[PDB]
Write an enzyme that holds these catalytic residues in place. Structure first.
Site, PDB file in Angstrom:
ATOM      1  CD  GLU A 156     -32.931 153.972 150.605  1.00 56.10           C
ATOM      2  OE1 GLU A 156     -32.821 154.414 151.766  1.00 56.10           O
ATOM      3  OE2 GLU A 156     -33.235 154.699 149.642  1.00 56.10           O
ATOM      4  CG  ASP A 176     -35.432 159.835 155.440  1.00 54.35           C
ATOM      5  OD1 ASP A 176     -35.371 160.907 156.067  1.00 54.35           O
ATOM      6  OD2 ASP A 176     -36.115 159.716 154.401  1.00 54.35           O
TER       7      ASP A 176
END
Ligand SMILES: *SCC1=CC(C)(C)N(O)C1(C)C
Ligand SMILES: [Cl-]
Ligand SMILES: [Cl-]
Ligand SMILES: [Cl-]
EC number: 3.2.1.17
Length: 162
Positions: free
Chosen positions: A11, A20
């Site tokens: 991440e 994202d």
């Protein structure tokens, strides 16, 4: 290696609101703020999450706090889900981390829908499960990350993260 180190790799860490892989506003270590296209909406979610009027920017400590909460939430989501709990219970600690990883990324409901993959995992048919997991939007949209997670399910080692 452990679930925290694993997700930290997958991440990353960013202290300002960013989008994202799906184009959704996110911050910290993969903390999804909202699927709303509105940056103002995302900033509101951030302020609510952190408990203060932020400037779209948080500290590393704050990022790690959300991360701890999010990992805990993923585990709690697995254990409360009728489809995921049996699979999780049946797995070793390394593969448990792989399942938590999937739930972190896609959410409880999303992973619970992987009915055939889940059955193969519970059956401990690792190669077949790995092939089946790759037949997904998940794999297609994030192939390198999915490959690491799938390899973890296949081998039950951390080889993909070393
Ligand atoms: S998918 C995990 C894996 C194990 C090993 C045999 C070491 N590999 O080369 C790959 C990456 C296929
Ligand atoms: Cl990310
Ligand atoms: Cl497919
Ligand atoms: Cl990827």
């Amino acid at each position: 290696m452990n679930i925290f180190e694993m997700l930290r790799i997958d991440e990353g860490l960013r202290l300002k609101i960013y989008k994202d892989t799906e184009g959704y506003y996110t911050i910290g270590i993969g903390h999804l703020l909202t699927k709303s296209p509105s940056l103002n909406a995302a900033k509101s979610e951030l302020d609510k999450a952190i408990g203060r009027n932020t400037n779209g920017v948080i500290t590393k400590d704050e990022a790690e706090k959300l991360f701890n909460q999010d990992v805990d939430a993923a585990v709690r989501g697995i254990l409360r889900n009728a489809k995921l709990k049996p699979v999780y219970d049946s797995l070793d600690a390394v593969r448990r981390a792989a399942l938590i990883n999937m739930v972190f990324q896609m959410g409880e409901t999303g992973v619970a829908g992987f009915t055939n993959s889940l059955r193969m995992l519970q059956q401990k048919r690792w190669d077949e499960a790995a092939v089946n997991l790759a037949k997904s939007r998940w794999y297609n949209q994030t192939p390198n990350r999915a490959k690491r997670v799938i390899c973890t399910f296949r081998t039950g080692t951390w080889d993909a993260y070393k």
